[PDB]
């Protein structure tokens, strides 16, 4: 595992040198390495130190970040975390003079952006007033949040200077935007009241944050695009091409008056207009479409009672019953589900998805999991309160001796649609070298 | 600025602790630190060391990479590189027992993915045969290639086991896919023959490579999507939502047989069908559409003589004359242009774009550049053969005392459209915190 990570780091060093058109001799000269030695660092015979990575960021126009791999802590492609481990991670935090939350980690991975916490509400309120002084608010946090409610939990949320309180119960859920302040209390001291607060990051975190942080606040603010504003998207692509209204009109076959009008409205153009504009701009129609959001006051609440329900693979012989939980079209790759596992057999493999997956066993019976990864088959059993992390691409099935429920949150990773289409365009054999460069570029 | 970068690293440390719901004392417990030291690290009283970052990656489900900022090496928003500096970076490479290429760096930044080399063709051929033994091929490299030709350069390229040669002349260009093998030679020893080989990264480099490398080649290949393949895109979203053909038909109003058939073809559904399917899947129609490509043999060649040209900002105000160079809809955010600078005054500012920009002066007269960044106005001059790098969001003008030509390559950075939608959805005032977290989460 450490040797595999070292190999990944060595491949990144060769890739960086190849990309800078530095062959072995040129890289040794730039990095102050002994003549003839570069192959020993690229092959793994010599370790790549933080000293060398720091020297490379000074000698070359790259960052220390560009030479570091990430860790693989999910070697079987799925990993379970046990209740005992979650309880050992316990943190109690006081707010307003008394204990307010108990936090427990659930299944996480260095390969994924999940930060999923079990959190019990320790503050009990006697009304649903958002301005109740017993409520201790947070400041909001960068990560998106999907929250699943168990018991009589009150959800408090703030946006544009107004505080709201929506009472929840078991099976309700909410999806929420970055930096939206919120809080949770219990309406009763008599029954369990807790949440699965499954926060996660996506594209905002990682490379985008590092880059935008160097540009500064003004440049970053100026790159923002408001959801649903198609005219702004069109203006942005026009600016990226350095085209003009009359030139785009001439190339697309649209009237100049129409192109100007489309630049000034959030409503999308008609489909034939979008196709003509896209071709004139050298982009797919995909790039002129802007997602809408369903959020209001920066959250989208899904009542469990009215949530969509369906059976898999179908009602004639159902293995699972799914309930659709809260999400948002700003994050089309986030799927949240309550899963009733009905089958006692391993006869219903779920289709592999490009998403990361997180599982948490809500029901009273254990769930047996069977999965495949890199030519091996594995099996395991999640007890109630156990959780699991699954990398993209894994085929697994679930079963239980009696019907039982689990919570499933699936999120997009860094392999976005654009990445996946780039992978699809690569010539045969190239994906291997993309994963781990193994040679000088000539 | 090392001090600013150290502050960025401190902020990432606070953010990582916030995301894991570790306050100061909890973080000190997890990391084995003495009491009070975690505040010292976040505040800057103690420097953040590789030892601390390594400890964090061992104790917490994060990567060392996640705690490192990138460098700001473009403090004025635009940075020029001079002929003398490019010449100083000269590297001569032999292939087949004699000189083949001279490489020279041009403007680059730790904030962008450009790897732009000036490259002189040192191998002279007497025919255009791709199997000529004087032609020495590379193995293909990870980065995308955008190449502008000067002089009688032969371009050689391989795809699918076949080798090709297209004789180029000044003003021709080509855009090429990752790992497509290629070469360049000169048809004459008696005139300059060289290229601007403006390689760059996109979606593939950085986070996505790091994650995919830990999943392995089998999973990574399974995630590929073929450009143009709408049925694969539909199947992907269906698998992400765990909707069968029958359930998606049920929701959308399309017949079961029609949904199944749309999953078996690259051709897109009809627009009303796409609208109904997207609504049923909780996504914008954008997520059922796919990029297409125009590449043949993995490249897209643009003859200079047939390239589209237009005046900017308009026909009746031609400050500049643009020539559209080689690109592809697989990279909608890549704009390649040859720019004839016609105005002698800085009276035609180019609108700010979300793209990074790279400039190289091709013509025989200097180009004056006036730009603004962070409330300050700057003036500079690019001599023939000088280059420049520009961060996103900069407004600049170009002027010259006589018409002169500049090569421009604009590429998308890590702030993808999805990042920009997310920035637009963020509550007002939170971009400061996104750039640099400055507080405990509660
Ligand atoms: Fe939260
Ligand atoms: Fe190349």
Stated resolution in angstroms: 1.8
Strand order in the sheet with A98-105: A91-95, A98-105, A115-121, A194-200, A144-150, A173-176, A299-302
B63 touches chain A (CB under 8 A): yes
Residues in B closer than 8 angstroms to A58, CB to CB, are: none
Residue (of A168, A72, A82) closest to A360 by Cα position: A82
Q: Tell me which DSSP letter residue B81 carries.
A: E
Burial A324-342 (b: 16+ CB within 10 A, else e): bbbbbbbbbbbbbbbbbbb
Residue (of B173, B97, B104, B96) closest to B137 by Cα position: B96
Residues B99, B193: one domain?
yes
Residues A150, A179: one domain?
yes
Give the whole-angstrom CA distance, residue A16 versus residue A61.
Answer: 10
Distant-in-sequence, close-in-space partners of B417: CB < 8 Å, separation ≥ 6: A225, A233, A287
Residues B142, B193: one domain?
yes
B351 touches chain A (CB under 8 A): yes
Burial B413-436 (b: 16+ CB within 10 A, else e): bbbbbbbbbbbbbbbeebbebbbb
Distant-in-sequence, close-in-space partners of B87: CB < 8 Å, separation ≥ 6: B104
- Exposed (0-12), middle (13-18) or buried (19+): which is B239, by Cβ within 10 Å? middle
Helical segments of B60-130, H only: 83-88
Question: CB–CB of B23/A93 below 8 Å?
Answer: yes
Element (H, E) at A250: helix A245-252
Residues A194, A325: one domain?
yes
Give the whole-angstrom CA distance, residue A271 versus residue B413.
Answer: 28
Token pair for B339? 């720019």
- Exposed (0-12), middle (13-18) or buried (19+): which is A351, by Cβ within 10 Å? middle
Q: Position of tokens 């929506």? A: A166
Residues B310, B351: one domain?
yes
Residues in B closer than 8 angstroms to A251, CB to CB, are: 308
Residues A201, A89: one domain?
yes
For residue B110, the tally of other CB atoms under 10 A from its CB is 20
Residues B281, B335: one domain?
no
Residues A177, A274: one domain?
no
Domain boundary among B271, B294, B317: B294
Give the whole-angstrom CA distance, residue B60 versus residue B71.
Answer: 25
Q: Is B91 in contact with A177 (Cβ distance < 8 A)?
A: no
* Domain span including residue A393: 71-205+295-414
Residues A288, A147: one domain?
no
Residues B40, B110: one domain?
no
Element (H, E) at B280: helix B271-281
What's the Cα-to-Cα distance from A262 to each of A235, A240, A288, A381, B421, rounded to whole Å?
9, 17, 11, 56, 19
Ligand 2 centroid–CA B215 distance in Å is 28
Distant-in-sequence, close-in-space partners of B127: CB < 8 Å, separation ≥ 6: none
Give me the residues near ligand 2 (ion), CB cutoff below 5 Å.
B 145
B133 touches chain A (CB under 8 A): no
Residues in A closer than 8 angstroms to B73, CB to CB, are: 61
Domain boundary among A277, A294, A311: A294
Nearest Cβ partner for A242 among B335, B394, B433: B335
Q: Position of tokens 């009542």? A: A303
**A 30-49 near B (Cβ less than 8 A):** none
> CA nearest A414 in B: which residue?
B208
| Alpha carbon of residue B263 to chain centroid | 31
Distant-in-sequence, close-in-space partners of B51: CB < 8 Å, separation ≥ 6: none
Give the whole-angstrom CA distance, residue B245 versus residue B256.
Answer: 6
Label residue A429 left, alpha or beta by phi (over 0 means left) and psi (-120 to 50 means alpha).
Answer: left
Q: Is A115 in contact with B20 (Cβ distance < 8 A)?
A: yes
A164 touches chain B (CB under 8 A): no
Q: Give the phi and the psi of residue B256 in degrees, each rounded to 5.
A: -50, -45
End-to-end CA distance of chain A: 30
Give the whole-angstrom CA distance, residue A295 versus residue A157.
Answer: 12
Q: Give the phi and the psi of residue B362 in degrees, each rounded to 5.
A: -85, -30
B234 touches chain A (CB under 8 A): no
| Alpha carbon of residue A235 to chain centroid | 29
Give the whole-angstrom CA distance, residue B39 versus residue B28.
Answer: 9
Distant-in-sequence, close-in-space partners of B278: CB < 8 Å, separation ≥ 6: B284, B285, B287, B288
A214 touches chain B (CB under 8 A): yes
What's the Cα-to-Cα distance from B363 to each of B104, B277, B298, B343, B385, rounded to whole Å?
18, 52, 30, 15, 8
Beta pairing, strands B317-324 & B309-314: antiparallel
Give the whole-angstrom CA distance, residue B142 versus residue A434.
Answer: 7
Residues in A closer than 8 angstroms to B236, CB to CB, are: 353-354, 420
Residues B364, B442: one domain?
no
Give the whole-angstrom CA distance, residue B263 versus residue B313.
Answer: 45
A110 touches chain B (CB under 8 A): yes
Residues in B closer than 8 angstroms to A108, CB to CB, are: 61
Distant-in-sequence, close-in-space partners of B62: CB < 8 Å, separation ≥ 6: A110, B16, B56
What's the Cα-to-Cα distance from B77 to each of A105, B91, B368, B373, B433, rounded to whole Å?
42, 29, 16, 6, 21
Nearest Cβ partner for A203 among B224, B422, B437: B422
Helical segments of A74-172, H only: 83-88
Residues B239, B179: one domain?
no
B317 touches chain A (CB under 8 A): no
Q: Is B333 in contact with A285 (Cβ distance < 8 A)?
A: no
Nearest Cβ partner for B415 among A140, A211, A271: A211
**B 276-295 near A (Cβ less than 8 A):** 281-287, 289-293, 295
Domain boundary among A273, A294, A315: A294
Q: Could you give the count of Cα atoms lying within 13 Å of A313 in the half-sphere of its Cβ?
A: 7
- Per the structure, the count of domains in chain B is 3
A25 touches chain B (CB under 8 A): no
Q: Tell me which DSSP letter residue A142 carries.
A: S
Residues in A closer than 8 angstroms to B431, CB to CB, are: 217, 220-221, 224
* Helices A271-280 and A245-252, axial angle in degrees (round to 10): 110
Give the whole-angstrom CA distance, residue B244 versus residue B424.
Answer: 34
């Amino acid at each position: 595992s450490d040797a595999a990570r070292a190999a990944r780091a060595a491949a990144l060093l060769r890739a960086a040198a190849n990309d800078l058109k530095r062959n072995d001799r040129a890289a040794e000269a730039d990095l102050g390495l002994p003549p003839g030695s570069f192959g020993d660092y690229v092959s793994g015979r010599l370790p790549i130190t933080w000293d060398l990575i720091s020297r490379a960021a000074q000698a070359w126009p790259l960052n220390e970040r560009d030479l570091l791999p990430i860790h693989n802590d999910t070697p079987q492609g799925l990993r379970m975390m046990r209740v005992k481990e979650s309880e050992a991670s316990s943190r109690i935090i006081e707010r307003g003079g008394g204990p307010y939350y108990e936090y427990r980690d659930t299944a996480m991975s260095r390969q994924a952006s999940y930060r999923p916490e079990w959190i019990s509400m320790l503050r009990v309120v006697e009304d649903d007033d958002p301005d109740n002084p017993l409520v201790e608010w947070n400041k909001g946090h960068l990560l998106y949040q999907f929250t699943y409610f168990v018991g009589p939990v009150n959800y408090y949320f703030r946006s544009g200077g107004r505080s709201h309180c929506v009472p929840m119960n078991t099976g309700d859920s909410v999806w929420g935007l970055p930096f939206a302040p919120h809080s949770f209390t219990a309406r009763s001291a008599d029954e369990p009241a807790y949440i699965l607060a499954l926060t996660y990051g996506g594209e905002l975190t990682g490379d985008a944050q590092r880059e935008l942080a160097t540009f500064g606040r003004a440049v970053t603010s100026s790159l923002a695009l408001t959801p649903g504003d198609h005219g702004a998207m069109l203006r942005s692509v026009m600016a990226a091409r350095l085209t003009t209204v009359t030139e785009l009109a001439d190339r697309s076959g649209l009237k100049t008056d129409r192109v100007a009008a489309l630049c000034r409205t959030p409503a999308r153009a008609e489909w034939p207009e979008l196709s003509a504009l896209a071709e004139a701009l050298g982009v797919s129609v995909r790039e002129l479409l802007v997602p809408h959001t369903t959020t209001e006051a920066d959250v989208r609440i899904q009542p469990g009672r009215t949530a969509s329900r369906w059976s898999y693979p179908g009602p004639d012989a159902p293995a699972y019953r799914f309930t659709q939980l809260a999400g948002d079209p700003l994050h089309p790759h986030t799927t949240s589900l309550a899963v009733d596992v009905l089958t006692a057999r391993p006869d219903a493999p779920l289709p592999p998805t490009y998403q990361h997956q997180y599982l948490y066993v809500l029901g009273e019976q254990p769930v047996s999991v069977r999965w495949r990864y890199n030519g091996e088959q594995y099996d395991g059993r999640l007890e109630p309160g156990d959780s699991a992390y699954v990398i993209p691409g894994i085929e697994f099935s679930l079963s239980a001796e009696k019907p039982t429920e689990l919570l499933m949150l699936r999120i997009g990773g860094s392999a976005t649609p654009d990445v996946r289409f780039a992978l699809g365009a690569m010539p045969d054999g190239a994906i291997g070298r993309y994963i781990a460069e193994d040679r000088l570029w000539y």
